[PDB]
Design a binder for these strands. Sequence first.
RNA 1: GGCGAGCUAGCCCUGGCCAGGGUGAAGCUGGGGUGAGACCCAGUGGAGGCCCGAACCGGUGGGGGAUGCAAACCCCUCGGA
RNA 2: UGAAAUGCGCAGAUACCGGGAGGAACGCCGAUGGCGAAGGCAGCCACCUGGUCCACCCGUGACGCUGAGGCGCGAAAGCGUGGGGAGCAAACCGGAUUAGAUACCCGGGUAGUCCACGCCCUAAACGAUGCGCGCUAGGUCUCUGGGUCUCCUGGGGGCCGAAGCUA
RNA 3: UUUAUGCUCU
Lengths: 88, 119, 272
Amino acid sequence: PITKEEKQKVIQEFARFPGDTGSTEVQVALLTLRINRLSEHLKVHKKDHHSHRGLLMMVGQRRRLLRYLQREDPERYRALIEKLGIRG
Amino acid sequence: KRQVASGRAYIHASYNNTIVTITDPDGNPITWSSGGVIGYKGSRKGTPYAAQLAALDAAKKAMAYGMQSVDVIVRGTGAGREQAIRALQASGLQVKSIVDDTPVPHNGCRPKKKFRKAS
Amino acid sequence: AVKKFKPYTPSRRFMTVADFSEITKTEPEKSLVKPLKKTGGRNNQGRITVRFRGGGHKRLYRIIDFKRWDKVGIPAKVAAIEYDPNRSARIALLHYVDGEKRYIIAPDGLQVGQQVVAGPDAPIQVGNALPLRFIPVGTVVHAVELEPKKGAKLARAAGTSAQIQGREGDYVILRLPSGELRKVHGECYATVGAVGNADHKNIVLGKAGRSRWLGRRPHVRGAAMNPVDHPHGGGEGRAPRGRPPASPWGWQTKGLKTRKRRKPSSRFIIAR
RNA sequence: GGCGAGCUAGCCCUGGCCAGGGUGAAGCUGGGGUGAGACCCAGUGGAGGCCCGAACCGGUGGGGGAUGCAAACCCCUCGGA
RNA sequence: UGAAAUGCGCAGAUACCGGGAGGAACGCCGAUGGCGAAGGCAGCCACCUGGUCCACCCGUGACGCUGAGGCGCGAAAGCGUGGGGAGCAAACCGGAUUAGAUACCCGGGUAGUCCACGCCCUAAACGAUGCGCGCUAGGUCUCUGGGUCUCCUGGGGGCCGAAGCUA
RNA sequence: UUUAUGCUCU
Ligand SMILES: [Mg+2]
Ligand SMILES: [Mg+2]
Ligand SMILES: [Mg+2]
Ligand SMILES: [Mg+2]
Ligand SMILES: [Mg+2]
Ligand SMILES: [Mg+2]
Ligand SMILES: [Mg+2]
Ligand SMILES: [Mg+2]
Ligand SMILES: [Mg+2]
Ligand SMILES: [Mg+2]
Ligand SMILES: [Mg+2]
Ligand SMILES: [Mg+2]
Ligand SMILES: [Mg+2]
Ligand SMILES: [Mg+2]
Ligand SMILES: [Mg+2]
Ligand SMILES: [Mg+2]
Ligand SMILES: [Mg+2]
Ligand SMILES: [Mg+2]
Ligand SMILES: [Mg+2]
Ligand SMILES: [Mg+2]
Ligand SMILES: [Mg+2]
Ligand SMILES: [Mg+2]
Ligand SMILES: [Mg+2]
Ligand SMILES: [Mg+2]
Ligand SMILES: [Mg+2]
Ligand SMILES: [Mg+2]
Ligand SMILES: [Mg+2]
Ligand SMILES: [Mg+2]
Ligand SMILES: [Mg+2]
Ligand SMILES: [Mg+2]
Ligand SMILES: [Mg+2]
Ligand SMILES: [Mg+2]
Ligand SMILES: [Mg+2]
Ligand SMILES: [Mg+2]
Ligand SMILES: [Mg+2]
Ligand SMILES: [Mg+2]
Ligand SMILES: [Mg+2]
Ligand SMILES: [Mg+2]
Ligand SMILES: [Mg+2]
Ligand SMILES: [Mg+2]
Ligand SMILES: [Mg+2]
Ligand SMILES: [Mg+2]
Ligand SMILES: [Mg+2]
Ligand SMILES: [Mg+2]
Ligand SMILES: [Mg+2]
Ligand SMILES: [Mg+2]
Ligand SMILES: [Mg+2]
Ligand SMILES: [Mg+2]
Ligand SMILES: [Mg+2]
Ligand SMILES: [Mg+2]
Ligand SMILES: [Mg+2]
Ligand SMILES: [Mg+2]
Ligand SMILES: [Mg+2]
Ligand SMILES: [Mg+2]
Ligand SMILES: [Mg+2]
Ligand SMILES: [Mg+2]
Ligand SMILES: [Mg+2]
Ligand SMILES: [Mg+2]
Ligand SMILES: [Mg+2]
Ligand SMILES: [Mg+2]
Ligand SMILES: [Mg+2]
Ligand SMILES: [Mg+2]
Ligand SMILES: [Mg+2]
Ligand SMILES: [Mg+2]
Ligand SMILES: [Mg+2]
Ligand SMILES: [Mg+2]
Ligand SMILES: [Mg+2]
Ligand SMILES: [Mg+2]
């Protein structure tokens, strides 16, 4: 699983400012972490559909945010994506 | 092929019949009987009276080879159980104990349509 | 897996080929430990004694190592997995620390670059050979000896294996690929694991020629012959067998058992 | 009891041969596509008891030949290539 | 079995003991309980992983709701390729019953039931009740969190019920 | 453990 400092590492690295524990990007980035994890889990355990369900949910959520962010700030949209490697 | 005092008695009690085999201390049957050996056919054998008659013909043949004590063991429901257990005691053979070892699966093989009914 | 083809010709439509991704830098084989020239001949001294053979691709014989006690204790690295035309299984070239090279029938799982060893010692993992007596009851195994020191004979076909079922004296009880339960001497070497290339059974020759490549000439039915030739020859417009189905030489071929009755071997068997 | 596979059949060892054109499989690359895929589109590529057709191997139909050129031929036509 | 008959058995059966093989399902716990969006999920262990709730009031600052198409999942049966096959059991055979009995009862029994992979996309797939949000008495039983642990508070699962709704 | 069935319109 994603360990505490393991996710902390990410929280800090994307935080819009020392103290930011749930901005748009910190969330997007956070999701991205779990998604890529599961995505690699499902590649192995493919007949595990229930878990894949959540994946869709995590994926769908991530999209909603990014659409908001690219609506309010089309700059740190490119920035966030580029830094995460998303939208293919 | 031998005469042993201490022994062991087995009661197989099914809906259709009751059969009793009496073994040595080791389990090797010394002699046996059932509802049919008594003289009954059909469903008369599933009777508790047929069980009684049976368990006596068992014990009687056992005492022949010199049978004194047994450790009665019953397997299966049915009208044979008690009357067969009782009968034994009420003739020679002192019943040193009465164990119930009727086999039951922890949900093993699927049973026949007849014994499934519910789900 | 198994390779398939879009039907750009008939036959290519059903034709299916083996997957050769498992094959490590083969192509040129290992001229030393094998090959030898293989005397391709379809009859004995003079006459045909097995019908319908001949033709088919030329072959170099890879002289494989079917007795591993030959080098007890001496470990070795698996250098490559190779194609061997003389068997259904694949072969594994292995370099011994000795500097001695030998081929082995490649077991399922056996990865390139791993260590292998044989002897009463010998960790119970894939590729290692041991006298049967020292193998944990229940493990699957291949390339077994039938009598000690006489070389492997059993379970060598692609995908085959044998299970150690129990022990009894200086003998252990195997369940042979045929399903037969047999006692084999404990001293007989075996090697842990199934044979591999188990998809083998699933290829489809696809065409007549494909059978020609493998050296199998057309097989003709007694039904298509004349009485001179076969129990089933003659008639006058198709015909049932008109007698118990027979071989060209007269013996029945549907059920009639053929194993010699009073045979020393009989005392060590127990199945199908 | 011998003589025969210098014809013919099969097989074994070692060599040789198959003009030219057509169709364009996989794979590869790039692009689109997706959470990642399947997959789709191009281009590349050059597979096949694949196509047309000489050599070569055949012998389908017809005509001719019938004390023949010939104890199995010739012409036209046709099959594989 | 209603009673029987077919069936098995003096070629040594049933009953009993010891050894071995093999497959499937997991008794008590177990609940009128729990989890999941649904289908559905029940011995034990470990790894990988989804959803969900509570406390704190810490961060983003409407970033929400629904959702024609699309995509995914989807009991049982069924299908393809392999394997596996103990018990059970469509079909099928036999014994009974009956006017007949292609059924009901009995003895046999093959696909299938099991695993891998790939299809099929159905259902009384039922709470016959689409999803989200606010508003409108309470009583009691229960599962599971937090609590200044008689009581309060949050999320679930049941019954009885104010107001109202309903043929 | 043996039963099935009851013509047409009022
Ligand atoms: Mg009876
Ligand atoms: Mg027992
Ligand atoms: Mg000879
Ligand atoms: Mg010779
Ligand atoms: Mg000779
Ligand atoms: Mg085959
Ligand atoms: Mg043939
Ligand atoms: Mg003929
Ligand atoms: Mg001849
Ligand atoms: Mg003949
Ligand atoms: Mg004939
Ligand atoms: Mg005819
Ligand atoms: Mg001669
Ligand atoms: Mg010749
Ligand atoms: Mg030339
Ligand atoms: Mg060309
Ligand atoms: Mg590509
Ligand atoms: Mg791309
Ligand atoms: Mg080109
Ligand atoms: Mg292409
Ligand atoms: Mg061609
Ligand atoms: Mg053609
Ligand atoms: Mg043509
Ligand atoms: Mg041509
Ligand atoms: Mg032409
Ligand atoms: Mg001609
Ligand atoms: Mg002709
Ligand atoms: Mg002609
Ligand atoms: Mg002519
Ligand atoms: Mg003519
Ligand atoms: Mg003429
Ligand atoms: Mg031509
Ligand atoms: Mg008899
Ligand atoms: Mg009989
Ligand atoms: Mg006898
Ligand atoms: Mg037993
Ligand atoms: Mg629930
Ligand atoms: Mg349900
Ligand atoms: Mg969890
Ligand atoms: Mg706040
Ligand atoms: Mg603010
Ligand atoms: Mg439309
Ligand atoms: Mg699908
Ligand atoms: Mg389904
Ligand atoms: Mg199913
Ligand atoms: Mg199937
Ligand atoms: Mg099958
Ligand atoms: Mg019947
Ligand atoms: Mg009948
Ligand atoms: Mg009659
Ligand atoms: Mg009836
Ligand atoms: Mg039945
Ligand atoms: Mg049955
Ligand atoms: Mg069918
Ligand atoms: Mg639908
Ligand atoms: Mg349901
Ligand atoms: Mg309705
Ligand atoms: Mg609702
Ligand atoms: Mg809806
Ligand atoms: Mg809770
Ligand atoms: Mg509490
Ligand atoms: Mg409540
Ligand atoms: Mg109510
Ligand atoms: Mg009211
Ligand atoms: Mg009538
Ligand atoms: Mg009436
Ligand atoms: Mg009438
Ligand atoms: Mg009228």
